[PDB]
Write an enzyme that holds these catalytic residues in place. Structure first.
Site, PDB file in Angstrom:
ATOM      1  N   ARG A  54       0.767  -1.076  -0.173  1.00 26.42           N
ATOM      2  CA  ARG A  54       0.179   0.112  -0.152  1.00 26.42           C
ATOM      3  C   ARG A  54       0.835   1.401   0.333  1.00 26.42           C
ATOM      4  O   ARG A  54       1.492   1.369   0.953  1.00 26.42           O
ATOM      5  CB  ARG A  54      -0.975   0.287   1.596  1.00 26.42           C
ATOM      6  N   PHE A  59       2.095  10.348   1.017  1.00 28.55           N
ATOM      7  CA  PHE A  59       1.567  10.731   2.408  1.00 28.55           C
ATOM      8  C   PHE A  59       2.612   9.886   2.778  1.00 28.55           C
ATOM      9  O   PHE A  59       3.068  10.093   3.876  1.00 28.55           O
ATOM     10  CB  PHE A  59      -0.017   9.628   2.576  1.00 28.55           C
ATOM     11  N   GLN A  62       3.509   1.701   2.834  1.00 29.19           N
ATOM     12  CA  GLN A  62       3.265   0.438   4.060  1.00 29.19           C
ATOM     13  C   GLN A  62       4.287  -0.756   3.133  1.00 29.19           C
ATOM     14  O   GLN A  62       3.754  -1.023   2.544  1.00 29.19           O
ATOM     15  CB  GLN A  62       1.568   0.657   4.054  1.00 29.19           C
ATOM     16  N   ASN A 101      -1.020  -0.405  12.510  1.00 26.58           N
ATOM     17  CA  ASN A 101      -2.387  -1.051  12.604  1.00 26.58           C
ATOM     18  C   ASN A 101      -3.799  -0.893  12.350  1.00 26.58           C
ATOM     19  O   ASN A 101      -3.941  -0.117  11.452  1.00 26.58           O
ATOM     20  CB  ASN A 101      -1.408  -0.493  14.751  1.00 26.58           C
ATOM     21  N   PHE A 112       4.735   1.761   8.256  1.00 25.88           N
ATOM     22  CA  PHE A 112       5.090   2.869   6.726  1.00 25.88           C
ATOM     23  C   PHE A 112       6.159   3.595   7.605  1.00 25.88           C
ATOM     24  O   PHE A 112       6.879   4.101   8.390  1.00 25.88           O
ATOM     25  CB  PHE A 112       4.048   3.494   6.844  1.00 25.88           C
ATOM     26  N   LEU A 121      -1.485  11.216  12.930  1.00 28.44           N
ATOM     27  CA  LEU A 121      -1.091   9.991  13.083  1.00 28.44           C
ATOM     28  C   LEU A 121      -0.411   9.741  14.661  1.00 28.44           C
ATOM     29  O   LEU A 121      -0.453   9.267  15.229  1.00 28.44           O
ATOM     30  CB  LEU A 121      -0.378   9.734  11.919  1.00 28.44           C
ATOM     31  N   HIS A 125      -0.267   6.234  16.261  1.00 28.43           N
ATOM     32  CA  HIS A 125       0.895   4.902  16.272  1.00 28.43           C
ATOM     33  C   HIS A 125       1.949   5.565  16.429  1.00 28.43           C
ATOM     34  O   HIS A 125       2.572   6.587  16.520  1.00 28.43           O
ATOM     35  CB  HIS A 125       0.882   5.021  14.015  1.00 28.43           C
TER      36      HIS A 125
END
Length: 164
Positions: A54, A59, A62, A101, A112, A121, A125
């Site tokens: 991903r 951004f 991942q 997560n 990531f 985040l 995270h």
């Protein structure tokens, strides 16, 4: 000192180069140790041969789902999941390494690498390191992502390990 680990990444079988990560074991020793051991493969499983599944431009990239290769899997060296260690380190900019997560206290093996400041985040995270070398490789990976997360090339961690 803190561990230094590496990921060597291919895209469609073509080498992109190496991402070197510092693991902040001084701040998050349990989280750092999990990632370190998954890089060496010393417990009998880990990241070698798995993918960045991903990737979202502007951004993050991942990876870490070495069991299902799609975001539903992975496991830690401690068991299936382990707690959020702390939220001391923040998502300050590109190059931050943080645990993916499925809500509070669901860390496994997915992670990531940020390509922007992902401040929203913070507190959700666990940040546990950052890119020491290889942001160029991270930006190449990023360029093969899309808004949906689906990658346009197969992005594989062909090798990984510990440097120090």
């Amino acid at each position: 000192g803190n561990p230094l680990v590496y990921l060597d990444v291919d895209a469609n079988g073509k080498p992109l180069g190496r991402v070197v990560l510092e693991l902040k074991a001084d701040v998050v020793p349990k989280t750092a140790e999990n990632f370190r051991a998954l890089c060496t493969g010393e417990k009998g499983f880990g990241y070698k041969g798995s993918t960045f599944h991903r990737v979202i431009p502007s951004f993050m990239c991942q990876a870490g789902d070495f069991t299902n290769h799609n975001g539903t899997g992975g496991k830690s060296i401690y068991g299936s999941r382990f707690p959020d260690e702390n939220f001391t380190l923040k998502h300050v900019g590109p190059g931050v390494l943080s645990m993916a997560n499925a809500g509070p206290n669901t860390n496994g093996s997915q992670f990531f690498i940020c390509t922007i400041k992902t401040d929203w985040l913070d507190g959700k995270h666990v940040v546990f390191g950052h890119v020491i070398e290889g942001m160029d490789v991270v930006k190449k990976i990023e360029s093969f992502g899309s808004k949906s997360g689906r990658t346009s090339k197969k992005i594989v961690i062909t090798d990984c390990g510990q440097l120090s």
